[PDB]
Amino acid sequence: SMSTEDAMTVLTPLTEKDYEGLKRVLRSLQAHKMAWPFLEPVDPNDAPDYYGVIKEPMDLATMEERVQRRYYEKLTEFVADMTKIFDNCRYYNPSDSPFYQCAEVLESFFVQKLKGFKASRSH
Ligand SMILES: Cc1c(Nc2ccc(S(=O)(=O)N3CCN(C)CC3)cc2F)nc2ccc(-c3cnn(C4CC4)c3)cn2c1=O
């Protein structure tokens, strides 16, 4: 149920079995054809003033490092880091940018996969 998923998302410490789920979610995003702008950090020499404007940069390779290192204690923290990728992209870029489009598509995919992860955890 949505009740159980919400409670577990905020309160339930991530287990090793949860981490196998988080690796599956991250690998599914890295394989998505619209992940191409998010696999590595933004190149400063491509994106003028990016690191002056975006205060909390994030990318899928940094998320992979944090997952491998068992950085996250709560799913909320994993979701907050992932959400930076999409929010940062939509903030820095105009709405007609290919990067902006990729953020919209990959976030919708992540939201589908996250809901699946939560359900699998609640069962
Ligand atoms: C998310 C993101 C982003 N991620 C990203 C990461 C890597 C690669 S990469 O193919 O590996 N590679 C591309 C070539 N570099 C020399 C090396 C890197 C491509 C990427 F798109 N790249 C850029 C690049 C440029 C801009 C930009 C530049 N000006 N503006 C206007 C708003 C002022 C936007 C935004 N960007 C982003 O937002």
UniProtKB/Swiss-Prot annotation:
It is linked to Neurodevelopmental disorder with dysmorphic facies and distal limb anomalies: An autosomal dominant neurodevelopmental disorder characterized by variable degrees of developmental delay, intellectual disability, speech delay, postnatal microcephaly, dysmorphic features, and mild abnormalities of the hands and feet. It comes from the Eukaryota. It is found in: Cytoplasm; Nucleus. Interacts with MAZ. Interacts with KEAP1. Component of the NURF-1 ISWI chromatin remodeling complex (also called the nucleosome-remodeling factor (NURF) complex) at least composed of SMARCA1 (isoform 2), BPTF, RBBP4 and RBBP7. Within the complex interacts with isoform 2 of SMARCA1. Component of the BPFT-SMARCA1 complex at least composed of SMARCA1 (isoform 1), BPFT, RBBP4 and RBBP7; the complex is catalytically inactive and does not remodel chromatin. Within the complex interacts with isoform 1 of SMARCA1. Residues 13-117 form the Bromo domain. Regulatory subunit of the ATP-dependent NURF-1 and NURF-5 ISWI chromatin remodeling complexes, which form ordered nucleosome arrays on chromatin and facilitate access to DNA during DNA-templated processes such as DNA replication, transcription, and repair. The NURF-1 ISWI chromatin remodeling complex has a lower ATP hydrolysis rate than the NURF-5 ISWI chromatin remodeling complex. Within the NURF-1 ISWI chromatin-remodeling complex, binds to the promoters of En1 and En2 to positively regulate their expression and promote brain development. The second PHD-type zinc finger mediates binding to histone H3K4Me3. This is Nucleosome-remodeling factor subunit BPTF. Ubiquitously expressed, with highest levels in testis. Present in kidney, liver and brain. In the brain, highest levels are found in motor cortex (at protein level). Phosphorylation enhances DNA-binding. Highly susceptible to proteolysis. Belongs to the PBTF family.
